[PDB]
Symmetry: D2
Subunit: 260 residues, 4 copies
């Protein structure tokens, strides 16, 4: 069997076992993929977390805001997979926005330094990861990022919505670069997933926002099940979406296709 048999795939963004990346990595491993992982803050804790995947996988440090980490990344990855071997797949599952650009804090009170850091990590970094990894990627490869539909404004998401709008633009441009390698670049726009990234009058906004997805989705939406979005990322890492790039696949129960 194995949708990803033989593929060498870099998966970023594991922080907890509820991380979307954790489930992406699990499903990928279940589908015969050979993985390499990157982690940001507390690598020791992440190692214990990543010890719970179905199989072993090298874990490397990557602070996406660090020039040196990015500069060194491709070399460190070739070490881990073996010289003369290249990546078939790259997963960007990283996002951040300071608290000030987030929930109840007034949209207008988020300082640019805070917004800029959010855009760096959640949007720009998608291009910088591509810059680093494209040199060590095989023809027919696949870059996949994580998106939340920013086409309309909403409560609480605030400046992360802007970052995702920026990220979507970046993706279309990465696709132009990636095509030179016969590599695709796409985003998976997920419904809300109960993650540790994801408070009274603001918690009221979040729940109504959440309850909306399952109501609008013709096939429903389960906030506590990360695996349909995991599967969707693997569909795109696979050879079965060979003619789609610079695009957005919506793994959201169909909520975005329905007004109510």
């Amino acid at each position: 069997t194995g949708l990803l048999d033989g593929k060498r795939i870099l998966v970023s963004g594991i922080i907890t076992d509820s991380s979307i990346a954790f489930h992406i990595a699990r499903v990928a491993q279940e589908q015969g993929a050979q993985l390499v992982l990157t982690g940001f803050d507390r690598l020791r804790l992440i190692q214990r977390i990543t010890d719970r995947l179905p199989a072993k996988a090298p874990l490397l440090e990557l602070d996406v805001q660090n020039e040196e980490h990015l500069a060194s990344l491709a070399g460190r990855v070739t070490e881990a997979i073996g010289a003369g071997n290249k990546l078939d797949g790259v997963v960007h599952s990283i996002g951040f926005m300071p608290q000030t650009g987030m929930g109840i804090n007034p949209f207008f009170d988020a300082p640019y330094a805070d917004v800029s850091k959010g855009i760096h990590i959640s949007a720009y970094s998608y291009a910088s990861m591509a810059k680093a990894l494209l040199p060590i990627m095989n023809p027919g490869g696949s870059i996949v990022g994580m998106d939340f539909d920013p086409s309309r404004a909403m409560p609480a998401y605030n400046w992360m919505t802007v970052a995702k709008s920026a990220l979507e633009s970046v993706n279309r441009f990465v696709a132009r670069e990636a095509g030179k390698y016969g590599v695709r670049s796409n985003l998976v726009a997920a419904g809300p997933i109960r993650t540790l990234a994801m408070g009274e009058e603001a918690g009221a906004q979040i729940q109504l926002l959440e309850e909306g997805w399952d109501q609008r989705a013709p096939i429903g939406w389960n906030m506590k099940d990360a695996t349909p979005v995991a599967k969707t990322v693997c569909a795109l890492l696979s050879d079965w979406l060979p003619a789609t790039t610079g695009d957005i696949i919506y793994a959201d129960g169909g909520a975005h296709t329905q007004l109510l």
Copy 2:
């Protein structure tokens, strides 16, 4: 293995071995799907074409404007697949517009009876086939139709564009109905593919503007496409369709997947 191992799938739209439906069917079978084929007019001709598939598949007559072919369809399919078996997949790959609604004929000169026949067959029938077949589809199933991105106007495509716009809208409503059965409904928006569908339109536009316009439209696709586009190769779109028929896109419905080389994401 087989992406579609054990799946029973209905595929409509085979007319030539260059039909998108032909290639969708070839890949499905290659991936272990058990198929039922529906064909429109010249069934003896379609049979010889479907004879070219790598595995047997019964062929059933379906004229999608014939309410009687639709009434009997679920019954005829169940006969073919076996009592107590249902479908997991359905492929709508049918389209038509009178000459009058396309190519060189002025947009304004298409009479409504023509436009309406094209809309019946190209857009409305997606709902028809879904109404007929949902009763005999399994939970986790999938309905897929073929789209050509009508979000902007363009030369020659004319009233087929208007029909695809209706198709897209119809798809969102079919998804609402299909959701009740645990079934998905989606469109694949294909880049241009060398099939025989455009033959008389392209042939009749030879010395004319819009013949040139159609050629320009086609040549610019591979230019726009960040990974390129090959009109002679229907297999990347046949795979995209198989992908939506598989269990690997389980959270997408009412939606459109673009199998066009990324062309629609690029201005130039």
Copy 3:
């Protein structure tokens, strides 16, 4: 000044005095436009309604499904407005879908005869009116039709959503044709209005909530003014396009 000072404008769609088209006509006359009106079936009743407009306006019969009505339309319009004069504007404010394609009736149970009539009246007719009228329009002119955002599916609206999706596509192509004459073609996607045309209430009440500046289903005049903005020379570079007069509801998730 007068936003529509000296312009000759055709307005279809008036069947009652709460028709969006009645309000378009009223605001247009207040703005100095000289109108020609078209009516469908109850022409004697329609004249009674149109007498309540500020100024007079010739009323012409127009069944959009009638081939001869369409072929004579331009001649009948030019008779009305007088020799040497031409239209500067056309308002398409017509729509119909059999009950079978709407509301409570199952989406699958709408026969195609019903769907096809609805698309004939609601979408194709936008092309036929432009076909009829463009030969007697001035450059700089403007054709405007009425939309209701069909980009997402929704309860009740059903096959009329499909009709509007069709209409948006027809508009892009009408724009191609009208540009050959220096004329613009655009749609106004309006929020829901209390006009004569369970979930219906839930859906419509979402508008005011979603709209950053609110939405009043009982007030037609904001949308009428929008139509007039597009009939004017103040949007001279927009065609094949859609203007949203919905309080901004379509730009917000909740």
Copy 4:
């Protein structure tokens, strides 16, 4: 007479008399508007330029990255228009992106410091101008920003394209804020106009020819055609958005591009 009669409108982004903002300001004054103008850096020569406007208007220095230009903006506007008078209109016609993110420079070589500056000037500033001026705006007022359709990627526009995608997102959130004041917020997505900033994009030595093919392609795809030398159709569109005639549209985008974006070719 006049679409904008008796309205007080701030117009930013005048650099030359070919600036889109110069034409918005000229059209607005011809329609009866009473203006306050802001200028970025060459203030002495911006004054000489704004002297070419049909009527005199106060000029205020505004650098959109400068915290105290923004903190003092409302006070300085209020002095200009006179106490107890508020604005009815605000026009954001500003944009910048460092050369690294801007043309034939490879997309991957623009440093994030360069990208962040462009996003700051071209996008965030729409929010900071709104934050500043909404407290001095009347109900029924209008904030307008300038856009170039970023829904598709393209040669040359590069990271400015990313900036515009963020700008469109920011506009939707500004509308929620503006809503509370009875004020609308919208963008005008303009077609290409021969402007000082356009010279920052094109060139490849190749600038004249790249501009020929731009004009030819745009005009061709636009059903009503397109003239890059004429900013007045886009100016009229901004004025239309500042008037009372689009009263039910916010968080939205009006395309003044000859209809090119509705057409594939």
